[PDB]
């Protein structure tokens, strides 16, 4: 590293401290918009919903990037905010902020505080109901809001929460869809919890004027990517998939008929669907399945995928910093925990490579790096944050990791990856709260412990070289860490307390990164490919692209994109460009899809929209979203036998 | 509170410190037996069950009342303990301690470390299975142990964990019964979570040689008092069946009011408290009280709050005064109240606000809400449930908040010296507390983020408190333990600093209480009665007794019981000595049971063991356990009719 710039003098002039006198309850801090100036500090209280309580939430606004906060509590006089609700921030550049509150004395409805100018000016609005869930912006229109009342009434607002109109009265759960479509379940008898398995799923495209019952005997439903899900009670629970907003459905097809199992949707996008199916009976870990572009035909993707028995949380992770990369945890035959990583969107999984920082070697199960995610959070392990990545910060992945030793499981370490998870390196000791900013230019981290802290660990070279910085002589008990939005942001905000009086610390890094990076500061790198050969070194699902990376200890402000230029180029297909077909799987550290043993010599059939099909394949099919052309082109054929099996438990 | 005796000198010589070097993971501490001087300190690790990990738990033992601890880790080396298991301490005089462990490298089964001499000498025994749950002693015999394996197998041991024998293989939940009877549920298809509502309840009296399927279509089952409960699925509808003869004959619970949700709050040798959720799951239900057979219930309390996910309530049984119970309800203003009964659920009143209320601005404001399991489930800052002891007659210590949302975030510690009738705020902020010396000493420790070093104790039943600095190096509090015994004077605190180094502090109060109390140290008091007149002031279910209470700032050792040892005089019956009969209820602040509106002009019929009965009552029935004679005695009569209904879905 050899970092010798006097960072103390550059940061001391930029360390803006603001003391908040006597804040009771949980304190929330949020930057509002990029390059706006607006920082909100809200006071929240943990209070049961239906209980009417007295209280006054304190609100402070800064319009000068954390330098001075103005007390604007009179805006929300005689109201208070609950912790589970908090702020309702709209999409990027929408400038919309909703503050759902409750009247201090009590009322016949809630009260919101609405703003469209990046929280610079709020307006008061009395709700004709008490909200059960938080306001939900529509992905198509930020002016449209749906909410659920304490009386299970569905309320819609067309004008950014000013006027609300109830559209149904027995709603259990409502979610936005594409093009302002609202999907919601309703019941008739008693309660929602008593009629689980006997619910009706309705659709509305007119914001409450037209309805269409698209499903009966519904247990639950969800949206993911271009797919609509619904668990239907056949008693037996089966997952049905719809891509046409619920007009036509199709039952999910697995290479087996495992009755009364437990199904779960890990993730889904505009290409495919990740499904987690629990192992039969109560054995623990399940098996991941990958679907086609229609989300109907699944195949075994990864065996022994761990999950939490009560909750169902897994270590499945979306590497947002590199396309097609996903990381999760599995259990080996030695009953040790491993971290599996795929670079081809679930096509082939391989073990996570142990860090180059070799400080280690059933002794082989030891030294295996386990990246903690939602499964580790549910197991009550000391993991303060899930894996964090950003699309702007291409290749940067920061997360907690442990070793096979139970001591390292009790105290995980912070690992940094600059190639999307292919290689790792221990950079920080102990658990930390971290964030990414400046499109990956600055990475901050704060110690997570019981003692008060006062040290900022940051890095300007994408987490390659770190250096500490004391930002206060009065240590504070850490509460939260926030960053300014935008691609060229350079500020953070830390707020904590002593013993109890609160205080915030806003740090500017503009003086640290005084020089703009040049071509002698950027080293390039290519994404990892499971197949050998220089022809596809750097190809990501059939698309080869080049990426930039700051050199070690590069103290400079990067104002460029990490994807270089356009340069469209197609790669030839290979093993990494094809999923295993219906009834096929890849053995451990293998590159060929063999056929499942119990399916050899049988009729490969699966009911596709109520019509049976016969599959004749070599064991491969194209990955949904893969744009490879040429090279490997295996032969597969779907033969329509016109024989009809019932695969739709909906009207 | 004119307390000026030098507490520093008496406690400093009795404050014994011991430091533990290089401790990783959670730290448990337990006194082993009364007047034995044995203290165990165990290191536990939070590790998933089916995952085989490497680790070593450290074990320390003190045999001189916490003055010196000896490292005895070599006894349990190459093994580790999970935090969810910990120690398995038997009854007080049993001297039995079980240490369920897991082999550091992995094995075919767990390993236990058994001791019968108050943890003075342990023996090693390899289990033929991996335990899913902790060892369960039997109430009839401490030598009998049942455990549940990771493969849902039920194992029993007749000789204190020395030899184990499996008796069933598809068990979902097992519980001990009276006289070593074992009740357990089993399935057949798939898993236990999928067979909910279709389970078989079996009985065993010979530790696994003979069986008897006493129930079919079972959803759940539990034990309480002299009653066995079983949630039976009729169609689909879930109904509760009560059995007093260990499951040989059942009888469905009869209530004055479809597909609702039932819950068992508490159960005695006399009656049963039953919670029934209102149709809609709006967060509140109704408490029902039964007869001596636990069949005929009646509306005892309306709008009883419960957690929607979990079903926990604020129902608290004041063990320090017979027939007193405290729970939380929801008012018509949707504010939370604490209701208290002094006649075992016959009549409920509002908890009286403390004297000289600091909040004295509104009517619903200033109301005291005692926190219990419901507040714990609401994720409120309540470290302990209400604490009381039958030895410490009348003493109740609990956390309480006000109508303000700030007070809910930081509840205060309230003390009652009359079983819950009157209260007073004694300590600011949450605390961990304990009772000692049969009520002579009440210790309390501040709960916060900062390190602590103060012991708050009271010798006059919590009327006057005094702080005590037990260390110059403050520690982060972890746990507070007490030596068993009616005349115990020792406590054990253990915490850490900042790596992280642990330390324990054992404090003896023998020198504080050097004088035995005398006649001018005790002030007499009578229990509270809802009915007016001096003829019933002090009656508890027909028995009037006089209780003793230490004067304010009474620094002395209690020599006699707080109850004047006589034969108590019998009280004449009145309205407070009668429950509301089947189909009746008491309105708010009303002492007369009026008939339920929807039942006026109908045949009050309830199926008693498959046979109809006709109720002709004035609206009252004697409380099970009330021994009053004379006074009021309204007429009621149960005539066996000719109709024979079906009130049993079991065979
Ligand atoms: C992080 O916060 C700082 C403030 O501490 C943001 O820097 C910028 O602060 C300057 C003043 O130092 C504002 O610049 C301008 O001042 C000139 C006169 O000197 C005036 O003519 C302009 O109208 C403007 O007020 C500047 O607007 C402010 N910029 C932002 C984005 O708020 C800093 O930019 C923040 N982080 C980043 C890099 O976004
Ligand atoms: C409310 O809390 C009290 C706290 O003690 C519970 O205490 C006790 O419950 C036990 C078990 O039924 C009673 O013990 C019984 O003693 C009689 C003596 O004749 C004996 O024959 C029985 O076999 C049993 O051991 C005990 O009397 C009772 N409380 C006291 C100390 O008076 C009580 O169960 C809880 N209330 C409810 C409704 O569950
Ligand atoms: C709370 O802990 C203290 C110790 O810190 C206990 O006081 C101790 O009482 C025991 C009684 O067994 C004394 O033990 C010794 O017993 C042997 C038996 O042969 C005898 O030879 C010794 O002369 C001695 O009596 C021990 O010395 C004594 N320690 C102190 C400092 O008082 C106390 O009993 C515990 N609390 C309660 C209420 O039991
Ligand atoms: C998170 O996973 C999703 C897939 O589950 C990825 O989704 C697409 O990412 C690309 C950019 O790499 C976007 O252009 C698409 O709009 C995303 N949505 C789709 C196809 O559903 C996503 O890349 C991962 N995280 C991020 C934001 O990079
Ligand atoms: C806040 O509202 C209350 C009404 O509940 C009013 O009495 C009070 O004056 C208001 N305070 C301010 C500063 O406006
Ligand atoms: C258990 O302790 C013994 C010494 O008491 C030690 O030699 C051994 O290495 C430990 N366990 C194993 C098998 O490693």
Residue numbers in the entry:
A (entry chain B): 53 to 286, 290 to 416, 420 to 557, 562 to 713
B (entry chain A): 53 to 287, 290 to 311, 314 to 416, 420 to 557, 561 to 713
Q: What's written in the study?
A:
Sortilin can trigger internalization of ligands from the cell surface via endocytosis and sorts ligands between several intracellular compartments, such as the trans-Golgi network (TGN), endosomes, lysosomes, and the secretory pathway. Sortilin binds and sorts a broad range of ligands, and dysfunction of sortilin has been linked to a wide range of disorders.
We determined the structures of the glycosylated luminal segment of mouse sortilin, s-sortilin, from crystals grown at neutral pH (pH 7.5, one crystal form, 2.1 Å maximum resolution) and acidic pH (pH ranging from 5.0 to 6.2, three crystal forms, maximum resolution ranging from 2.3 to 4.0 Å). The structures reveal two distinct conformations, a monomer at neutral pH and a dimer at acidic pH. The eight independent s-sortilin molecules in the three crystal forms grown at acidic pH all form homodimers with an identical interface and highly similar structure. S-sortilin dimerizes through the top face of the β-propeller, i.e., the large side of the β-propeller disk opposite to the bottom face at which the 10CC domains are located. Despite three internal disulfide bonds in 10CC-b, the three α-helices that form a small hydrophobic core in the s-sortilin monomer change their conformation into a three-stranded β-sheet in the dimer.
